[PDB]
Structure formats: C-alpha cells, structure tokens
Design a protein around this ligand. Structure first.
Ligand SMILES: NC(=O)c1nnc2ccccc2c1N
Length: 270
C-alpha cells in the first residue's frame, strides 16, 4: 500500500508469537503476517548492519526464489531497529539439529540434507550469486525436515570487522579455501570449498571442523595442503564428493551442477 515499495513490509501487519533464537544480527522471532501467514522476524541490532546497502540488495534478494532457499518476504525499513521478514523454519538451525542425537539419523537422511543445500547452491550459482558464508550455522530446517540455505550474501553488510577480515577473531577460517585465507580471493569456488566443509559437518553430526586446532593452526594446516578426513558415517563415495571440493587449485573444484549430479548418483547407488 501507499507508503510502501515492493520490498517493504508494514510492521503493523505483524503479530509476534514466540522467540526463536539469536544470531549475529540479534534476536529472531516467530510471528504471523496479516493474521494468517507464518513468518520469521529478524530484528536487526542497531549498528550491526550496513542498512542502506542491505536494503538496496534486498530488492535483488526478493527475486531469488527456489524451494531450497529460505525466502525473503521483505524488510521493515525506516524504523529502529529494522526487521527482515523471512520464511519460517520451525526446526531452527541445521547445526543444532545435527547435534541432537535423539534424531538417530540414517545416512540416507544426511545425504538428502546435502542434496537440499546443493540444489539451493546450484540455483544461486546459476544466478551468479555467491553465498559468501556457507556453513551449517547458515542453514535452517523446516517442520518437514527439509534443509534450506539462509542469509545468502548477508556477510557483505556486517559492520563488525572481527567477522569480515580473514584476520578477525570471528572470520569463518574453518570454511575458507587457501586463496581466501591467503589473499581474500572470493569466487564460486570459495562457495564450493565451504559446501564441502558443510557436507563434512552434516556427516559429522555437527562437530566443529578441525575441532582440535585453533583458527591459526587450521589456516596453517590448509595452506600446507592438508585437509579434513572422512567422517565415520560417510561412505567412500560420499567422502570422494566432499573431498573434491577441497582441491588446492580452485579451477579443479567442481561446480554445484556437477556436485548435484554426483550426489544423485550416490543416492541411486546407496
Ligand atoms: N527463519 C527461521 O524460522 C529462523 N531464522 N533464524 C533463526 C535463528 C536462530 C534460531 C532459529 C531461527 C529460525 N527458526
């Protein structure tokens, strides 16, 4: 309506129901839009985000639509704090979900989670859109157990320098290829590397990558050509897939289309 662009949601249409959790931008709540439609409401902590830049990018993100990507519905702007309104994912963050041993996952379920993420990422790749911070902590799980990729591209708007410099205390060292660690070379192939680490997180039931090492030790390990090794729950074929994401030479790493084909092959074989 009148004072709202297509990317803008009227916060007055929101009913707040429950708190879901917190992230690096702050608190996330479950609510309803216009009394009926489930939404997640990300309340963006003051000073945490480059907001004008994010809002311009929201216009682009509005048009990214794929069943395995957490949908952006709009933004509540020109208020303090701003809200990001997204698809509601009732089972919360993938990392926490993996760590709950009650689920007693079959490896077929783990492979399906990898396929869900790979489909989202193949779509993003087809749009030349980098995630830039792919990891289990940035995947969500809905009430049907479907995994979807969340917060794609959002690291570009984070004002905390501890997160954004490869040297920073909060940079995702453990999800980064050598060329990112060494000279900040981001590309489709840094997303591919991260995807490999994510498969490792899934098959490891949410263990931290390089769990015995500091970030500094991890960077040394990786730069010296060494890698994560096979999670107990990963078959030889599944391990081959994740390991292919970690070629020292970025151009030798697969595309998400190729990874998707390889995952489907293993699903048919296993
Ligand atoms: N989109 C969602 O439904 C959602 N988004 N962000 C979260 C952060 C922490 C814990 C849970 C959630 C969550 N369920």
């Amino acid at each position: 309506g009148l004072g709202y662009g297509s990317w803008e949601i009227d916060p007055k249409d929101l009913t707040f129901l429950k708190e879901l959790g917190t992230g690096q931008f702050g608190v996330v709540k479950y609510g309803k839009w216009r009394g009926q439609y489930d939404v997640a409401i990300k309340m963006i902590k003051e000073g945490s985000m480059s907001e004008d830049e994010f809002i311009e990018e929201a216009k682009v993100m509005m048009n990214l639509s794929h069943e395995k990507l957490v949908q952006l519905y709009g933004v509540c702007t020109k208020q303090r704090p701003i809200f990001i309104i997204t698809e509601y994912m009732a089972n919360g963050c993938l990392l926490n979900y993996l760590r709950e041993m009650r689920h007693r996952f079959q490896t077929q379920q783990l492979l399906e989670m990898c396929k869900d993420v790979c489909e989202a990422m193949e779509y993003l790749e087809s749009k030349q859109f980098l995630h830039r911070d792919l990891a289990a902590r940035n995947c969500l799980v809905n009430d049907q157990g479907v995994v979807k990729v969340s917060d794609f591209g959002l690291s570009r708007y984070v004002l905390d320098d501890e997160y954004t410099s490869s040297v920073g205390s909060k940079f995702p060292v453990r999800w980064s290829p050598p060329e990112v660690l060494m000279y900040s070379k981001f590309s489709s192939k840094s997303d591919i590397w991260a995807f490999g680490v994510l498969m490792w997180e899934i098959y490891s039931l949410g263990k931290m990558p390089y769990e015995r090492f500091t970030n500094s030790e991890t960077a040394e390990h990786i730069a010296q050509g060494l890698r994560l090794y096979r999670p107990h729950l990963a078959s030889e074929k599944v391990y081959t897939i994740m390991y292919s994401c970690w070629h020292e030479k970025a151009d030798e790493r697969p595309t998400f289309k190729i990874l998707l084909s390889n995952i489907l092959d293993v699903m048919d074989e296993e």
